[PDB]
Amino acid sequence: LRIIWGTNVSIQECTTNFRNFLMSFKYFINNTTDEELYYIKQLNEMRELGTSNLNLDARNLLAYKQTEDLYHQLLNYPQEVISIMDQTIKDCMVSLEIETKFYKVRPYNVGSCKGMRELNPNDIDKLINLKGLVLRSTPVIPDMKVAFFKCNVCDHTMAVEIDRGVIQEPARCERIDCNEPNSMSLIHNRCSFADKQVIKLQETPDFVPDGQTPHSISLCVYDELVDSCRAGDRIEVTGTFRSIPIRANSRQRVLKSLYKTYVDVVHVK
Amino acid sequence: SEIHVRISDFPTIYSLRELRESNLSSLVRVTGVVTRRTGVFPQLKYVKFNCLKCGSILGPFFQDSNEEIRISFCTNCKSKGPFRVNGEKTVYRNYQ
Amino acid sequence: HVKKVDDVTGEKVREAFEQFLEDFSVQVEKVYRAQIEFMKIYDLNTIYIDYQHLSMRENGALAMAISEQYYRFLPFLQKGLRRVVRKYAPELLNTSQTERVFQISFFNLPTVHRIRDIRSEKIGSLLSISGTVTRTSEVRPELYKASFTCDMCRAIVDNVEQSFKYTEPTFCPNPSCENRAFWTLNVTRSRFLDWQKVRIQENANEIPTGSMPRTLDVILRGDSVERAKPGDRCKFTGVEIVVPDVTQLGLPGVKPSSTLDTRGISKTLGVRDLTYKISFLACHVISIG
Ligand SMILES: [Zn+2]
Ligand SMILES: [Zn+2]
Ligand SMILES: [Zn+2]
């Protein structure tokens, strides 16, 4: 039972726990679709249609005796649980291009909760759902993943991968012949970028404590979910709860102790 | 790391009293007697400098045997600040 | 003397574009070669090529590659043009003594993209967009190839490529001087281009349900300046570029950052922000409807 530090998760435990459920699921009940092997139709039809996203309802799992544990673990450590859940799919798919295509899950039935303003700081890095009306969205913003460096004395080109936001700029040329200090230049248009958009949502909770005026929330949608929401739309959103420190002003590298809050969206209804 | 050339024969042989200012910066061959000698002192050959703001070792620089060499720019921190020779990482030459 | 590394595929695409220039026939003549002579009779600087001609040669290849990696291949296509002019028009290479700046213009692409469909995986490629023009600025000179003087020694370094920013030389050419940071600019003997900025807006019929129009900044160079009036519907063909943006400091999310690697440096701090916004640089402007 290896436990990942800071969590209660065992990767092998959860992968094996998940593949049995994915290969066998149960449930005014029919005999045509309510008593058949459910999810292998969902996977087969997915691969047949040429599709990449599996949409995974949540309360499915709070009944089946094994994966009950996994429901609590998914509502507490979304980062580590969703990487376990993908390797199950691309293993399960060949078990049934499929050696170079990436799979994703999208939980959309997380419940309970009572609004953004009732959440405490102990709910950071947790999965929550929101309902509301969209007002604004900024145009697409390019986000850098792989950078491009050129040696200005030898024309040797290097590529670097972003690691948790930080880019490591080489100090010495890598060529065994041209070994110079500080010869690396950055060419912006040769780099690889990705999509980012910011939405502003007017939250419409169910419980409104005495004297709450309406407020607005910020949501970050990446890659596929771009231009998927338009102003005036009433939507339901699943995502993670984050916090970030902001810089006091542009000139100084100083930060502010009070944090800023937002939501990383995973599913949209 | 380096091979030295020494010319063996050479026609014109001078005495010390014949030399004049027309002989400056030229190849000569002379005779004489050795009257004094000094000890062996080291001379700078491949010099490494320290940047006293970012603590970096700047790479090999060559000494020409004419005038002392001094640097002015740190490539990592971009400064013209104080700079001092690293005695431990330097390579020296024999002098007498 | 260090050996410069070469892009093999760059050489192959240069050779292919040279064959394209020198061996195209339409019902019969060599159209581009005719235009070449046409530019000596009136002293012009721009070459207009048709994209449908690029595709047909070598079915499924030259055109696919140039469109998808234009930012890389543009200098090589410029060099090929220079070699063709050297052959069949050597007098045109000199301004009526400096060299004459050459500009290439593609048009008549298969598809026209909407402003609200631009993504970041098309950065540095060739595309055509539509919009409505609202604001134009006056024509101003732009620094293209500059001359610098050393401050330790006084040597002259000429023809430094700027590439969208104020670049300075990174090494004195004299094998003796070791200057790499201290330079001064001779504004008298530097070469400039003409520069204008245009603002565009989304067309009325292309706006989604419940949303407001979007905008984009368009950069024009050379002979393309002063072709767009306010209140026009135009189509632009050009390259999708990125420019620094300090307004993003405050938006939620992780904002990429840069730092220097201290693993490998012998010892006994320069963080820069990677925030950009999408802009557009145009080579062909046409007013339709
Ligand atoms: Zn190099
Ligand atoms: Zn330093
Ligand atoms: Zn110099």
UniProtKB/Swiss-Prot annotation, chain A:
Disulfide links within the chain: none
Entry superkingdom: Eukaryota
Annotated signal peptide: none
Family: Belongs to the MCM family.
Miscellaneous: Present with 8800 molecules/cell in log phase SD medium.
Function field: Acts as a component of the MCM2-7 complex (MCM complex) which is the putative replicative helicase essential for 'once per cell cycle' DNA replication initiation and elongation in eukaryotic cells. The active ATPase sites in the MCM2-7 ring are formed through the interaction surfaces of two neighboring subunits such that a critical structure of a conserved arginine finger motif is provided in trans relative to the ATP-binding site of the Walker A box of the adjacent subunit. The six ATPase active sites, however, are likely to contribute differentially to the complex helicase activity.
Protein name: DNA replication licensing factor MCM4
Organism: Saccharomyces cerevisiae (strain ATCC 204508 / S288c)
Classification of source organism: Eukaryota, Fungi, Dikarya, Ascomycota, Saccharomycotina
Covered residues, full protein: 177 to 467 of 933
From Swiss-Prot, chain B:
Biological source species: Saccharomyces cerevisiae (strain ATCC 204508 / S288c) (Baker's yeast)
Oligomeric and partner information: Component of the MCM2-7 complex. The complex forms a toroidal hexameric ring with the proposed subunit order MCM2-MCM6-MCM4-MCM7-MCM3-MCM5; loaded onto DNA, forms a head-head double hexamer.
Residue ranges covered by zinc fingers (C4-type): 51-77
Underlying gene: MCM2
Miscellaneous notes: Present with 1690 molecules/cell in log phase SD medium.
Entry's family note: Belongs to the MCM family.
Name of the protein this chain belongs to: DNA replication licensing factor MCM2
Biological role stated in the UniProt entry: Acts as a component of the MCM2-7 complex (MCM complex) which is the putative replicative helicase essential for 'once per cell cycle' DNA replication initiation and elongation in eukaryotic cells. The active ATPase sites in the MCM2-7 ring are formed through the interaction surfaces of two neighboring subunits such that a critical structure of a conserved arginine finger motif is provided in trans relative to the ATP-binding site of the Walker A box of the adjacent subunit.
Compartments (UniProt record): Nucleus
UniProt superkingdom: Eukaryota
UniProtKB/Swiss-Prot annotation, chain C:
Phosphoserine: residues bearing it: 211
Organism superkingdom: Eukaryota
Location in the cell: Nucleus
Miscellaneous note of the record: Present with 13400 molecules/cell in log phase SD medium. Early fractionation of eukaryotic MCM proteins yielded a variety of dimeric, trimeric and tetrameric complexes with unclear biological significance. Specifically a MCM467 subcomplex is shown to have in vitro helicase activity which is inhibited by the MCM2 subunit. The MCM2-7 hexamer is the proposed physiological active complex.
Entry similarity comment: Belongs to the MCM family.
Summary of subunit composition and partner proteins: Component of the MCM2-7 complex. The complex forms a toroidal hexameric ring with the proposed subunit order MCM2-MCM6-MCM4-MCM7-MCM3-MCM5; loaded onto DNA, forms a head-head double hexamer. Interacts with MCM10.
Function recorded in the entry: Acts as a component of the MCM2-7 complex (MCM complex) which is the putative replicative helicase essential for 'once per cell cycle' DNA replication initiation and elongation in eukaryotic cells. The active ATPase sites in the MCM2-7 ring are formed through the interaction surfaces of two neighboring subunits such that a critical structure of a conserved arginine finger motif is provided in trans relative to the ATP-binding site of the Walker A box of the adjacent subunit. The six ATPase active sites, however, are likely to contribute differentially to the complex helicase activity.
Name the record gives this protein: DNA replication licensing factor MCM6
Source organism of this protein record: Saccharomyces cerevisiae (strain ATCC 204508 / S288c)
Gene name per UniProt: MCM6
